[PDB]
Amino acid sequence: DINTKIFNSVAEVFQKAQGSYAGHRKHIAVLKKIQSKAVEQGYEDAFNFWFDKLVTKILPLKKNEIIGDRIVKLVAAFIASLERELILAKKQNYKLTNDEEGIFSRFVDQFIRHVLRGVESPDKNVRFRVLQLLAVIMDNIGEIDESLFNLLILSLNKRIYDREPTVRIQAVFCLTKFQDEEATRTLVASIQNDPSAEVRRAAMLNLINDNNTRPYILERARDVNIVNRRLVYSRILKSMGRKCFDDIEPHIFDQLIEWGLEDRELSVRNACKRLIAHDWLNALDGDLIELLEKLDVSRSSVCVKAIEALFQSRPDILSKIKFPESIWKDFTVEIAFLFRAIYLYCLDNNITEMLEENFPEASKLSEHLNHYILLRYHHFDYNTLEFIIEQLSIAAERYDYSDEVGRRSMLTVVRNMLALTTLSEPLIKIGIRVMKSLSINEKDFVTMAIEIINDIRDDDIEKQEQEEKIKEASSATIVLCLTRSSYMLELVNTPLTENILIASLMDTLITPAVRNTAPNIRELGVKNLGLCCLLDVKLAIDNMYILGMCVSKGNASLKYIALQVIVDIFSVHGNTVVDGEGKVDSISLHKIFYKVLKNNGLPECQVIAAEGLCKLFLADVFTDDDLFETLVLSYFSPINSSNEALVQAFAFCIPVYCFSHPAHQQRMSRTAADILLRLCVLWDDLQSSVIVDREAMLKPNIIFQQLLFWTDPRNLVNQTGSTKKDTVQLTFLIDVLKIYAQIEKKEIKKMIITNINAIFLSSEQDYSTLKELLEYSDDIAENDNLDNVSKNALDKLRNNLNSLIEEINERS
Amino acid sequence: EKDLMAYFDENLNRNWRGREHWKVLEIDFFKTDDSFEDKVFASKGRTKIDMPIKNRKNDTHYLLPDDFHFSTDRITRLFIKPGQKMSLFS
DNA sequence: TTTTTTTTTTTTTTTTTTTTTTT
DNA sequence: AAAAAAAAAAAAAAAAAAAAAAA
């Protein structure tokens, strides 16, 4: 009779506890009192049995339930309150109790052995509830036996490869409790191989940070899920804090910063900006020099996109930053980069107060730059001085030169700097930029650059003639002259007739260097010849067979530069340089483009050729069908599957072309059927090849779907109004149905016929085209032996066509 | 021309990989039963509760490929002269 | 007797941020 | 006053119905 009373009491407690969370302490108290009375009278087995019986009633409940979510928390609180008593008793002094450790151990053992009787139940809700109970009790369990531990590990390692993702999440929540500095090897296997994103997120969040597991955690920064890519920046690195500058490797850190500040999603970029501008800045003492020192500033190019973000979140720090006269003649890389970023951010906006109260004058900046120039090239490491000079030149290139004295001073400084022969390439480039910024018109910078080049050449010639005692310069002199002339020609936008100095430098330097034996001199000469052909049309017409021969016969860099030059010539001028008296025909250039497209040994050349051909097709130049067919085939080719840049370029260049103008969509539809024909042959040979990667090529149904997506008149960006009448997708379907009589296999026929009921059928469409499509579908349905799904699809298509034709017939 | 370029950059932002990714009340604790535990605690029988072996490992590790950023700005400029911008989409 | 794939279609759950609630 | 539970919205993608072979 006492068992009935125990059951009634525990059932009343459970009924009162499932209501709301308010009052979950008196319930624990009365449960403890009932258990104490039961173990004192001598009836604990009945108490355990009835507890298990009443707990079992919450297993069939669905995850989206609160009644079942209260009972698990009640049981967890009961276990925690029952173990905390023993914890406190063992903590403070050594108080002998009335034998409770054994009772607790037996209770946990029997409760674990009872709940594990449904770990392999067919109902997913029961398994979910069992795993959730185990996860919520694993926090408070104490010491257990070896048999129970082995059984638990076996059950978890069996349920980690479960069908339901939620059961797998509960399994990883259970497994993240048995880690130590077998569970780690299981967790790192789910972070890289689990098909569910929530399981990977849970395994990433609930994994210890150690030198052996940190790479696997940081690798999830390029996950296919946006939440997984955001949690690595808004949770992991935030919890690490200052340890990111000590444990994470420099290159991994720079790669993470690049991936964060250059993501295609707004949430990831916002999270990276929040982490950089707020958490990492507040982790220090509010200073910025230490933050710039943590980053590499030098030997990198990410801080330009980082500090700017810091200038968009906290503008107040932008006001406590100065450059007094004392902090001069002793700059580092951080201070120079800071000055550059400050000046650029103040000039890009309208912050004029700082512009007139912080930055010095031009006459002083010229002297400050000349000081470092003299320390470097006339008297602190070399790399630091070069970086400081580069930053100062970048800051001075966009400087306000209203005064004449400062302008003349900076001009003299840049002449004395560019007149050297030890200067590096970036310094030469930024000096050319500053020189262009220090000129009145275009008739002055060109003259100054030509004068500098001629002075260098004449100095070399005079030195050679003087040393001849005790008519062609050396190779290094030609290299420096061509390097200095490339950046000068890159800033000229005027006819070549108005500039006779460039016309002289052509046959004095560029033209003799074009036919040079050395490869680098030849490459620089080809680059200069291209930069000059993009200025005059006669020189561009007369210089094309040499570029064709350079592409056909030449090294990798030579073909690279020559293809770039040809693409730029066609983009600037057009069809004028071809088809005419004394001009290069278009067939030879088309053959060269074909040969460079089919060549797999040079992937970068393929990428450049594809990009240039897409650029030409996007304009009025190059209106051919075979070239477009070859482009689409190279996009859909199993050989070109290794080149990621080519695929990424085509995937962006084809849709914009097809959706820009209806003529482009018509050109695509006129050849998509033959493309599908040539594509269905390569799949058969790939599937029947015994030598391989059979999954490299896309399946024919996906190709047909993508081709139907490109020939849809509803995806046009103009939408004039007559787009509902134009019949572009019908001709493609008719051509596909005509080619259908040439396919050999039956699975290809099936996957082609199944993906037909997806075209645009309206009433404003034509009548004869719909009719012809009807007779074609009828012939295919009759004079053929199809299956069942293809037959049903064809019948549905014929019914739709008949309905549309009967509707159009009732008119006029 | 700027509006069309912005539209093409905004719409084609998530489809940069190509290939196959081209697509745009109250429980009564007093009532006792007998078939409840039999229906809850039982064998799996025929219904499988595990995932296939082929769907357990993947070589791609569910990672994103290297991004090259093919936008309208990159295709508008030239090659050897990034300052000039040819006329397209017009 | 499940299960399995393909096409076509329509929600569902999560996470962050606020209000109440219980001492 | 501090910690926990409940509720509304945005963000972002997994989930499901139908039909014909397959073990």
Author numbering:
A (entry chain E): 8 to 188, 205 to 402, 413 to 503, 568 to 788, 791 to 911
B (entry chain C): 387 to 410, 459 to 524
Quote the study on this structure.
It forms and enlarges loops in DNA through loop extrusion. The core SMC complex is a heterotrimeric ring consisting of two SMC proteins and a kleisin, and in condensin these are Smc2, Smc4, and Brn1, respectively. To complete condensin, two HEAT repeat-containing proteins Associated With Kleisins (HAWKs), Ycs4 and Ycg1, stably bind to central regions of Brn1.
To determine whether Ycg1 also interacts with the head module in the DNA-bound, clamped state we mixed the condensin pentamer with 80-bp DNA, ADP, and BeF3 as before and examined by cryo-EM. In this structure, the region of Brn1 that binds Ycg1 and makes up the “safety belt” (residues 387 to 524) was mostly resolved, with the exception of a disordered connecting loop (residues 411 to 458). The DNA is somewhat bent as it passes over the DNA-binding surface of Ycg1 and through the safety belt. The fact that we observed Ycg1 bound to Brn1 while not being bound to the head module of condensin strongly suggests that in condensin’s clamped state Ycg1 remains attached to the rest of the complex via the flexible linkers provided by Brn1 either side of its interaction site with Ycg1. The next resolved Brn1 residues bind to Ycg1 and form the safety belt around DNA (Brn1: 459 to 525), before Brn1’s C-terminal winged-helix domain binds to the cap of Smc4 (Brn1: 526 to 747). Based on our structures and published single-molecule experiments we propose that this is an intermediate step in the loop extrusion process and the variable distance of Ycg1 with respect to the head module might determine or allow condensin to make steps on DNA that are needed to extrude loops and to enlarge them. In this scenario, Ycg1 is likely to act as a static anchor on the DNA, which implies that the clamped DNA is being translocated during loop extrusion, consistent with the regulation of DNA clamping by ATP turnover.
